[PDB]
Swiss-Prot record, chain B:
<dbReference type="GO" id="GO:0048565">
    <property type="term" value="P:digestive tract development"/>
</dbReference>
<keyword id="KW-0744">Spermatogenesis</keyword>
<feature type="repeat" description="LRR 4">
    <location>
        <begin position="102"/>
        <end position="123"/>
    </location>
</feature>
<feature type="transmembrane region" description="Helical; Name=1">
    <location>
        <begin position="475"/>
        <end position="495"/>
    </location>
</feature>
<keyword id="KW-0399">Innate immunity</keyword>
<feature type="repeat" description="LRR 13">
    <location>
        <begin position="338"/>
        <end position="359"/>
    </location>
</feature>
<dbReference type="GO" id="GO:0016500">
    <property type="term" value="F:protein-hormone receptor activity"/>
</dbReference>
<dbReference type="GO" id="GO:0036335">
    <property type="term" value="P:intestinal stem cell homeostasis"/>
</dbReference>
<keyword id="KW-0325">Glycoprotein</keyword>
UniProtKB/Swiss-Prot annotation, chain D:
<dbReference type="GO" id="GO:0060996">
    <property type="term" value="P:dendritic spine development"/>
</dbReference>
<keyword id="KW-0209">Deafness</keyword>
<dbReference type="GO" id="GO:0007179">
    <property type="term" value="P:transforming growth factor beta receptor signaling pathway"/>
</dbReference>
<dbReference type="GO" id="GO:0060856">
    <property type="term" value="P:establishment of blood-brain barrier"/>
</dbReference>
<dbReference type="GO" id="GO:0005125">
    <property type="term" value="F:cytokine activity"/>
</dbReference>
<dbReference type="GO" id="GO:0009986">
    <property type="term" value="C:cell surface"/>
</dbReference>
<dbReference type="GO" id="GO:0035640">
    <property type="term" value="P:exploration behavior"/>
</dbReference>
<dbReference type="GO" id="GO:0051897">
    <property type="term" value="P:positive regulation of phosphatidylinositol 3-kinase/protein kinase B signal transduction"/>
</dbReference>
<dbReference type="GO" id="GO:0071456">
    <property type="term" value="P:cellular response to hypoxia"/>
</dbReference>
Amino acid sequence: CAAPCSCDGDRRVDCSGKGLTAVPEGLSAFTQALDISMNNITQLPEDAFKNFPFLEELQLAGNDLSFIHPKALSGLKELKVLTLQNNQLKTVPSEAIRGLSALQSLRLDANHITSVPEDSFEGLVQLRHLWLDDNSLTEVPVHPLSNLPTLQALTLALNKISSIPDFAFTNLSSLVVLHLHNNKIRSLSQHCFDGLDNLETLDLNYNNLGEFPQAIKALPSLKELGFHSNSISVIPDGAFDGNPLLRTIHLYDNPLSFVGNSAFHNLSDLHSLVIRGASMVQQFPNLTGTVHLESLTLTGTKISSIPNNLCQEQKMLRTLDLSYNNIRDLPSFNGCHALEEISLQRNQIYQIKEGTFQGLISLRILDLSRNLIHEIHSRAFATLGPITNLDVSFNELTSFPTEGLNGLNQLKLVGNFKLKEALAAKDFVNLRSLSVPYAYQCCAFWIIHCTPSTGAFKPCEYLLGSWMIRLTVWFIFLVALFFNLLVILTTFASCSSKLFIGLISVSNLFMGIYTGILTFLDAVSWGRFAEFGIWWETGSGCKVAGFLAVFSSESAIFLLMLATVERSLSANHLKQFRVAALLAFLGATVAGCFPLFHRGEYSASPLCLPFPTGESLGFTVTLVLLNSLAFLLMAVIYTKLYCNNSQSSMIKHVAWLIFTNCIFFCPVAFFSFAPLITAISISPEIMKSVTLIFFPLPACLNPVLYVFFNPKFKEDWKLLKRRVT
Amino acid sequence: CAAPCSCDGDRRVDCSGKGLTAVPEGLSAFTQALDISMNNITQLPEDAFKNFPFLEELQLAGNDLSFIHPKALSGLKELKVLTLQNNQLKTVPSEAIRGLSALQSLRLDANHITSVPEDSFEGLVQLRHLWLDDNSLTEVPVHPLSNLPTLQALTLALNKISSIPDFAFTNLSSLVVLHLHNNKIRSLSQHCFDGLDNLETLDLNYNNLGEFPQAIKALPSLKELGFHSNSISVIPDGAFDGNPLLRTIHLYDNPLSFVGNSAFHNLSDLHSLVIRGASMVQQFPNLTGTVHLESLTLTGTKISSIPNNLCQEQKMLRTLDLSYNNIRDLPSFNGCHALEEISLQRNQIYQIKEGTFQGLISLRILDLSRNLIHEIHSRAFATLGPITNLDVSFNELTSFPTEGLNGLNQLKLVGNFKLKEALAAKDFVNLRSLSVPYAYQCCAFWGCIIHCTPSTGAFKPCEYLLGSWMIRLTVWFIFLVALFFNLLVILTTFASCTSLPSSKLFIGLISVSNLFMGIYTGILTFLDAVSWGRFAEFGIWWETGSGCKVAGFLAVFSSESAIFLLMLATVERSLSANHLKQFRVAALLAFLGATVAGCFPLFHRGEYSASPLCLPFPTGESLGFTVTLVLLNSLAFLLMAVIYTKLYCNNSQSSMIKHVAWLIFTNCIFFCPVAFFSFAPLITAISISPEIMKSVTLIFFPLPACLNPVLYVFFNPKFKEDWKLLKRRVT
Amino acid sequence: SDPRRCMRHHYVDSISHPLYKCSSKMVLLARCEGHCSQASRSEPLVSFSTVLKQPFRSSCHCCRPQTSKLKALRLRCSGGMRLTATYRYILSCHCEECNS
Amino acid sequence: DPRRCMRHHYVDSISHPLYKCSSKMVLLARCEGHCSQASRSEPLVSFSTVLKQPFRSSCHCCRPQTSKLKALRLRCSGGMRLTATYRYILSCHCEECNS
């Protein structure tokens, strides 16, 4: 070897990383490839390559070169590859690059070239590859380009060319590749591509063309065409007429609106077709001749019918997306053997016939969501064995067959409301992902990881829960009902605060019935709260229960609010008091009946609680707020009398009742405002237990306060009871 | 295609394996290869291959063909390979292969061809390969062979050619391979190989050549030569002179006697040389030029020296076998780097110096057995690291160094008798096979997978001589008893000058014999008490030295003496139921015989060398006098019972009589196991273990010695208690 | 300098990503092609043991790269992201055995 | 054309390495010549982070097609009748080296 740079190889000297200028002196005179790229050479002096007469490849990329002497490239008669990218010039080298008749590849990209002298490219009789991209050219150098009949590749991308004049490339009979993308081309003349008979690739992406080019009817050898990311909106009828060998067409990212019926026909080499956004298309395109398609995509159009002759000639077809159309009849699919993916979402399909889905061995993904399908026969599913995804959602289904779908891996059936039946768990063994219409469904339905994800709010086995709670609620029904019985009999039998005592007695009766309904409901369905859930939560039971709870809870509180005022007023008006009691029952009835008309309520827990999970922050939130608003005034008046015989007993009886009510009403409210304070997470079933335990708790304890603990008028009635005895 | 054939292939019809008796018809005419071998075609009619004008390869082997029509092979102008082996052609068809100018390979072997017509092989201008072996040719067809200047291979083997005349192959300038083996060739003329300048392989194996052929000085391109299995005895000085490119020579299975000194020199391509049986060779051959040898073998000669520049001149050697010679001084082997195997067995090497084996990295196998080596320095053993086999056997070694041999895998040191030291067991960790000069030497490797050759058993233990803790307590008691008893008994007898009767007299003899044996048992016990749990370094010194002889004479002398002595007392009683003078002379002769009988084996070889007890008959490995001691204890015992049957046939006498009967009965009762164990191989004795036998032998052989000294003492208190009261007075 | 020896040629290739929307690139590549003068053969391998592990000892010579570089190109797709393409540019070519 | 892929013949002498095995000469066929399809080694352009086989190569070699195994028995100066085997080519053509 010789000199101090790398120099390693067979006649191949590589001094790229480190150097300055003048090229390495002292090198062998038989060097055939010099790579001095990425250095600080800014100018080539005259006769700067006189020690390398046999050099064939020269690389000068990455330098700061800005001046080439006309006689610098003298004696390089064997040079074949010259790279000059990433350097700086304002003219095509020109003069210096005239004695390079053996030159074949020339790179002039990434420079600041903005003018092409008319005398350039005169002397290069063997040029094959030319790079002219990443520059500031504003027009096609037609005249200089008419000196290279042997040119094979040409790139003019990333420039500022506005239009192509007539007969621009009328002398390149060997060009195979042409790139014109990332320019500002917006107009093309009629006679602009004449003489390009050997051209195979055309790129016109990222331009501002306004109308489909009619000049493409001159390239019979054209195979790949791309014109995506343009402003083409209308494709004329009969466009690709002179290009029978087309195999790839890119036309996406365009505001297409209309496509001619007889436009894609008679294209036997095309393998894919993706059209999206053709709003003003209402007929299926003609495809008599294009029988080699492997992916067909037609979405966003007004196509309402399909010609079933389609799944005939298209022998091979792998994906099909006909979404976002007005299709209502599913024309048979027998014949598309190679078809694998079908997308038919967002259409007007209403039925599914026996023969709709057959000849589908290789199906694997099916999508039928949002079609308003309501009738599905027991057929058109056996013929499709290897099917994994079955998306039928937001439809109007009433009965889902389970035959031939044992091989599914992901099922989506969420959105249907008329499907209240229970799906068989033995027919979806291989199923891994499930979504169902309801929770009971989930319930019922519930590594599967179902979407509803039932919790304590939706139990699958025990309504009430632990046997303890079960033994606790049986005792309340047996006590309250019977206890709240004789009390009213006395008052009812024999026509002050004594009234609100009977009035409070009545308020309890309704609450007990609610609990009894809940308990009876718990005893009928034991260890089987799966098929009794949907019927219970999407039907009349829940409403009645929610008015006997709301009517009874709210009524008691409201009723409990009038007795305190009565004592306060005693320590004439008798007439008014009756009228006041009749108005509370009516409100309680309204307050109770108000939620029976709006949507989403009495549908959060199987107990039909007023505020379960608080998922109505209206009445439920207002009810809790009103419960306390009302609770506040009673406590205020109590502290007020506190500030300063029978009356004492009544008073004592009433205080025991409110204290007891106030003491017993604290957890219900406390559980209502969980998200604000997070309450250290949510009671898994404790809330239910608490809610279950505490919400009807006053309905028994309260009435016992004056029963014998405070025998005032109640003791008079007990003595009256002994009298009846 | 046709019925009996494949016809399948790239125009390659194969119908072999069928029973066709004629050329099939209906085949394409573009067939280029027909294989109809192994059929029943016995004759080829005229114009039998007129439907295959483009055939190139034809195979007819395995048929019963015996007649070829002159015009049968007509139109086959493209035929190149013709195989006619395993047929019944009595003569080479000369008029049937004439129109085969494109022929290149021809096989005519395994036929019954015995005559070669002079007009044969005329027209074959492109022949390359010819087979003429497995026939009955008695001479070389010189004239027919002078028509094929383009012949390349020729095989005239397995025939009956007696001699090669002058200028036999004087026209084959392209021959490369020639085979002449398995013939009766016994003479070769001087000018018989002229013109074979391109010949490379020559094979004359399995012939009757009497003298080395001098005609081989005409083949400069010769590379492989084989004359093995001939009668060549002398190789002349300067033989391979015109063959400088030789690379392989086979000369084994010959009665070679003399080889010229300057005969194998100047052969730079030779890679091996194996010479065996050269009895009349006494000098190392000259090898100035042959420096590419990879295996040298010279055995059975009278070579007494080795040139000091053997290794220096040549560095290619892997194996060397200079065994069966008179070599006594080993030159320095420094220089043979690639040498791996050295065989030097059966020589007169007497010393091993420091620099003998210095500089041998690749040495793996060494053999120095039967050289009479007695001095080995502490050197010439470090420079050779990767050494596995070390055979030094049947030498005269006195001290074996253990440095630099830690890597051995198999050691053989069996045969030496002067190596009595113990080899360290920590220096042969990697060793796997061991053979040693003495049995007790295994106590150190096989504890105290090696699988040593002596294989010590009960007859040769390593820790306890006597054995368990029961037999040790039993022998201490005998010594402590017997020794005390016999002493007092004899002291009492030889006390009163009062005339001593013979019965009473013979009684003295039994006590004397008991004292004699007690001394042996005591020697054995003492001997057992001195070396406890350490019967390894005290074994060799005890069995290859003077102790054993004395013990074996105190055992033999005492056992045999008692029996012999026990045989005279019975006769004395029988005679009593004058002679007093004779009785004294008879006792003196028994001691002398006992002494002779005892001293007899003390002179022959291999005895008193079968067990550490020095038993008379341990393992019975002397079937003479050991088997003669058995004979004595037997016939003597038999005659002794006869006198008792006699006393039975018809006071003190009764007591004596009773005392002597108790003694013989006891002796006879106690002598049964010792004889019994002797005849094991005849009846196999249900495979008696060598330890019970020892235990029995050890228990029972000295058992009678402890009876008479005390039993007739207290048990026979008739005249014996009289003498007890006597000494009681001596108190 | 026979016009049919093992020498290296050039050509422009078309590079574009198959999934993302990327602006295509023209890349100059090299390739080796030509006839080697060493004739290829295949001989039988004779064995006196009992199993035929390898039944023929071939030779074959082919024109293959001797020294390649690894250059890469950042196809500049749209909407962020810059996928990267990599390849080895044949620096020289010669005739070597197929197996070895 | 003498430079095409052809089947040739030659002789070899066979003898067991060990054993005073006796000698025997037999006739063999090999393949030799030039094929008309040239070789090439075009690079592969990959977008994955991990590279792969960097070149997609092609090469044709004159390789055997039809072989018939044979067995041949000798005498090795002993009881054992050692048997040697080989493959007899009956036809040869071009095929990809890495087919």
